[PDB]
C-alpha cells in the first residue's frame, strides 16, 4: 500500500507527492512555457528534468538519476504537439528510505511515479500511463520480492527498478519503459522477476487510476 496526493503546490501547473515505505518524493511540472535559447526544439517539446537529493547538493549521483528518469518520460509525453515549448519537471526527494551511497533504486522508482502523477495534474498530452517498482532478491531464499525495505537491500544480491507502460484501462502493457538492474543475476531469474514485475505494476496503475480519479473528478463538473 502506497500513498499519493495530487495538486499540492500553488505556483506550478502540476504537482504530486509519492510516498512508498519510507521514501517520499515531491515533483513539480510546469508547461508548456517559453523555453530558453539552448533548450527550444523546432518540432517537439523540450524537457528540463532536475532531481535533487534529501541531503547535500546535487552531485553526480543524481545526474544519472535525471538521465534515467528522462528516458522514461520522453516517450510517455506527446512531445510533437508542443513545438518550441518547455516543460520543467523537478523532483525533490524529501526522504531517501534507503542508503544513498550504496543504493539508488527506490528513489528512481518514486521519482518516476511522482513525475507521472504531476504530469497528469498539469494537463500534458500523455500517450499512456506509467508504473515503476523496485525489485531485489535476498541472498538467503534467492526469490524475487517487490518494494524491499531498507534492511532488505543491504542483504540483496541484485537490485531492479522496472518501469512499465499500460494502456486500455490499465491492462495491456504497450512497452517496457525502464528495467535498470545492478548486482548478480542470470537469464533464468530475469524472466522470473519480469513476469512477477508485470503483475505488480498492473495493480499499481489500477491503484494510481483510483487515486487520480478521486481528486480530478471533484474538480471538474462536480
Amino acid at each position: 500500500s502506497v500513498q499519493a496526493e495530487i495538486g499540492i503546490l500553488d505556483h506550478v501547473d502540476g504537482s504530486s507527492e509519492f510516498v512508498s515505505q519510507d521514501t517520499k518524493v515531491i515533483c513539480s511540472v510546469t508547461g508548456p512555457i517559453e523555453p530558453k535559447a539552448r533548450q527550444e526544439l523546432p518540432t517537439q517539446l523540450a524537457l528540463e528534468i532536475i532531481v535533487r537529493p534529501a541531503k547535500g547538493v546535487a552531485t553526480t549521483r543524481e545526474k544519472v538519476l535525471e538521465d534515467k528518469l528522462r528516458a522514461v518520460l520522453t516517450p510517455l509525453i506527446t512531445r510533437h504537439c508542443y513545438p518550441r515549448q518547455l516543460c520543467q519537471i523537478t523532483c525533490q526527494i524529501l526522504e531517501s528510505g534507503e542508503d544513498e551511497a550504496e543504493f539508488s533504486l527506490r528513489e528512481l522508482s518514486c521519482c518516476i511515479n511522482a513525475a507521472f502523477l504531476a504530469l497528469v495534474d498539469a494537463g500534458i498530452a500523455l500517450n499512456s500511463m506509467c508504473a515503476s517498482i523496485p525489485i531485489a532478491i535476498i541472498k538467503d531464499t534467492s526469490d524475487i520480492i517487490v518494494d524491499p525495505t531498507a534492511e532488505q537491500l543491504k542483504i540483496s544480491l541484485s537490485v531492479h527498478t522496472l518501469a512499465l507502460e499500460f494502456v486500455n484501462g490499465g491492462k495491456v502493457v504497450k512497452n517496457v519503459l525502464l528495467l535498470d538492474s545492478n548486482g548478480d543475476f542470470n537469464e533464468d531469474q530475469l524472466f522470473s522477476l519480469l513476469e512477477l514485475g508485470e503483475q505488480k505494476c498492473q495493480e499499481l496503475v489500477t491503484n494510481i487510476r483510483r487515486i487520480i480519479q478521486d481528486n480530478i473528478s471533484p474538480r471538474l463538473v462536480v
Binding site: H11, G56, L94
Partner: protein, 302 residues
C-alpha cells in the same frame, strides 16, 4: 522569465494598503500561522506558513575544525532554490541575491549568534569535530522565504540527534544508530526571523527630506506584496529580549524610531512561535516514546 505585474493590479494593492486592507485578509502586524510537520528520521522538518511551504534536512559528519577556533564545531548551510517553488527561479543559480541573503541571515542567526552549541560539538581539539549541515528545500514560494527557512532550521536542529561517540584517549568510535540512542544537539537560544516590507504612497523625493513619515509597513508579506515592495527589513529576536541579528539594506530609508518599533512588534511574534515549536516538539516526542513512562530509570524515592 519574470513575473509580469499589470499596472491595474499594482495600483489596487497599494490603494488597498492605504485603506488598511490586505488581499489575504491579515493585519499590518499579523504573522502567518506556522505549521511544523516532522518527518521520519530526526532532522526532517516541514514548515508551512500560509501558502509558503519549506522543508529542511539536518545532517552531520566528522570534519576538521578551523585553525583559529579548534574548540568549536562547524555549521554548514546552503539554500539552493529550484524551479519547484516557481518558474522564475533559474536552477543552478547558487549565487542569487535571494539565496545569498538567506544563507547569510540564518548563518548569523544560528552559528555566529551562538544558537547551536559549537563548543559542545568538539570531540578532539583541532582534529575531530561535528559539522552540522542544514539543507533547506524551497517547495512553494509565496513570500517569507527567510522567515520560514529560519523556523525550519531551528525546528530541525532541536529535532535532530547526533550519533553517540566514546573517546578512548585518541581513538573515536562512532556508535551505530541501533547500538546507542543518538544524543540531541545543544541549543542555547531560539532565533526567529520576522521580515518587514515597506511602501511609500509618495515618492523618493518626498522621502529623503520629508519629516512626515507616511510609510506603510506590513509583517510577513506575500509574493504579490513582495513584488510591489519598496523597502525591506529583517530582524531576528529570541525569547530572552536579545536582538540576534538585523539586516536592512536599501529601499526606503527609515528612521530609528520605526525600526525600534519593528523589533517590539516582532518580539510578540517570536515569543508565540517559540512556545509553539517547544509544544510541537513535545508532542512529537510523545509520539515516538509512547511507553516512556515505564522506561524511566532515575526515579524519586519517598
Amino acid at each position: 522569465k519574470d513575473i509580469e505585474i499589470s499596472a491595474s493590479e499594482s495600483k489596487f494593492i497599494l490603494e488597498a494598503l492605504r485603506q488598511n486592507y490586505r488581499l489575504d485578509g491579515r493585519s499590518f502586524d499579523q504573522f502567518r500561522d506556522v505549521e511544523i510537520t516532522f518527518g521520519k528520521e530526526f532532522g526532517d522538518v516541514s514548515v508551512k506558513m500560509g501558502n509558503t511551504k519549506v522543508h529542511c534536512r539536518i545532517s552531520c559528519q566528522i570534519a576538521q575544525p578551523y585553525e583559529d577556533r579548534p574548540f568549536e564545531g562547524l555549521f554548514v548551510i546552503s539554500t539552493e532554490i529550484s524551479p519547484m517553488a516557481g518558474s522564475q527561479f533559474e536552477n543552478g543559480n547558487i549565487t542569487g541575491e535571494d539565496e545569498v541573503l538567506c544563507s547569510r541571515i540564518i548563518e548569523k542567526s544560528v552559528r555566529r549568534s551562538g544558537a547551536l552549541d559549537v563548543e559542545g560539538l568538539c570531540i578532539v581539539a583541532g582534529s575531530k569535530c561535528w559539522a552540522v549541515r542544514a539543507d533547506v528545500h524551497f517547495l512553494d514560494c509565496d513570500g517569507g522565504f527567510i522567515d520560514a527557512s529560519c523556523i525550519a532550521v531551528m525546528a530541525g536542529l532541536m529535532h535532530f540527534k547526533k550519533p553517540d561517540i566514546t573517546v578512548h584517549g585518541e581513538q573515536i568510535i562512532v556508535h551505530p544508530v541501533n547500538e546507542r540512542e543518538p544524543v540531541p544537539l545543544g541549543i542555547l537560544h531560539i532565533p526567529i526571523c520576522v521580515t518587514f516590507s515597506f511602501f511609500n504612497p509618495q515618492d523618493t523625493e518626498e522621502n529623503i527630506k520629508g519629516e512626515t513619515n507616511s510609510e506603510i509597513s506590513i509583517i510577513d508579506a506575500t509574493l504579490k506584496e513582495e513584488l510591489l515592495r519598496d523597502g525591506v527589513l529583517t530582524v531576528t529576536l529570541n525569547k530572552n529580549r536579545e536582538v540576534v541579528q538585523v539586516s536592512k539594506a536599501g529601499g526606503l530609508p527609515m528612521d530609528a524610531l520605526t525600526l525600534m518599533k519593528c523589533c517590539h512588534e516582532a518580539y510578540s511574534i517570536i515569543e508565540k512561535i517559540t512556545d509553539q515549536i517547544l509544544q510541537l516538539l513535545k508532542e512529537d516526542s510523545e509520539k515516538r516514546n509512547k511507553y516512556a513512562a515505564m522506561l524511566t530509570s532515575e526515579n524519586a524515592r519517598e
